[PDB]
Symmetry: C3
Subunit: 114 residues, 3 copies
C-alpha cells in the first residue's frame, strides 16, 4: 500500500522514526507485509481546513484490497490517533481518502501486480 | 471536500488570502458548509505543461457528491478563473482532476462519512 | 495526460532536461501530443519504501483512456527504466498508480474534456 500525509505542521515537529512507525502500524492494521508499504510525509504545507490555518492533515491510503466500510473506519481511528499523538493534529482536522486499487493499475518492478 | 493546487508559481506570487478565498468560493460552488472544505496550495513546484515551464497548475477537487459533467464544467470555469486572476496562470495550462468520493472512502475524525 | 513522480532523490540528482525527457517519452507512449502532457517531479521528499529510505519513487499516471492491463505493464517498464537510468532508483522501489480518467472528470481551459 501507499500512505501519504500532507500537513502544515513544521518539519521539526515530525518526530524521528515517524515514517517507520507509520510503516509498522499500517502493516498491523492492513495486514499487508511491511516490504510492500510505502509512506510519504509532507510537512510545512500551505493548507487550511474549514478556512482555519490551525494544524491539519490531508492524507491518502491506496491499497490493493483491504479497503472497505469497516476497514476504513478502523484505519481512520488508527491513523487519526497517530497524527494526534505524534503530530498534535486534532482528528476533526484530518481527511484521509481511501483508494481500492485494481492490481492491473499498480505498477511495480517493471510490471503490474495483475 | 478537498481542493489541491500544485503550481510552479513562486510562493511570493501566491497572494495573501488565497486559501481563504478558495475556501469561501468552494463553499458556495459545492454547496457544502465551509467547515468541511479543505484547501492546499503547493507553490514552487518543478513542473512542465506541454513541455514548457511557464506558469501552470495541476489541481484536484475531491467531494462526496456534487461532482458530475455539468457541475465540473462550472467548477472548471470558476477555478481556472481564480488561478488566472490570482496566480496569472493561463487556463490552458491548468488540469483539474475531479473525484466523486464514496462516503465510505473518506476518513475524518477517527471514522468515515459512511 | 498527467504524470507525477515523488521521490526522496535530491534536487541536484534530477538531471537537466528531465521534465522534457518525460514529456517526450510519455507523448510517445500515450500517443498524445506533447502539448497535452503535464509532468510534475517532486524531489527531496521524506519517504520510505518497505521501511527503507534508500532511493524510491511514488508516481501516478492519469490519462483519459490508454489505461489497461497490457498498456500499464508497458508504461511500468518504460517509466521504471527512466527512473533507474536517470534518477538511479531501483525498479523494485517504484510504485506507479494508473488512473483511467472519465472525460467528465477532467478540467482544462475553462472546460472539461467531455
Ligand atoms: O488531452 C487532454 C488530457 O490528456 C487531459 C487530462 C487531464 C487530466 C488528467 O488527469 C488526465 C488527462 O488525460 O485532459 C484534457 C482536458 C480537456 O478539456 C481537453 C483535453 O484534450 C485533455
Ligand atoms: Cl497494495
Ligand atoms: Cl466532501
Ligand atoms: Cl470513492
Ligand atoms: Cl474518473
Amino acid at each position: 500500500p501507499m500512505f501519504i500525509v500532507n500537513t502544515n505542521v513544521p518539519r521539526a515537529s515530525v518526530p524521528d522514526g515517524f515514517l517507520s512507525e507509520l510503516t509498522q502500524q499500517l502493516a498491523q492494521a492492513t495486514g499487508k507485509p511491511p516490504q510492500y508499504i510505502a509512506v510519504h510525509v509532507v510537512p510545512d504545507q500551505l493548507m487550511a481546513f474549514g478556512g482555519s490555518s490551525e494544524p491539519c492533515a490531508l492524507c491518502s491510503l491506496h491499497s490493493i484490497g483491504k479497503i472497505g466500510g469497516a476497514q476504513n473506519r478502523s484505519y481512520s481511528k488508527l491513523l487519526c490517533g497517530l497524527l494526534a499523538e505524534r503530530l498534535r493534529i486534532s482528528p476533526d482536522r484530518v481527511y484521509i481518502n481511501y483508494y481500492d486499487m485494481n492490481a492491473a493499475n499498480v505498477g511495480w518492478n517493471n510490471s503490474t501486480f495483475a
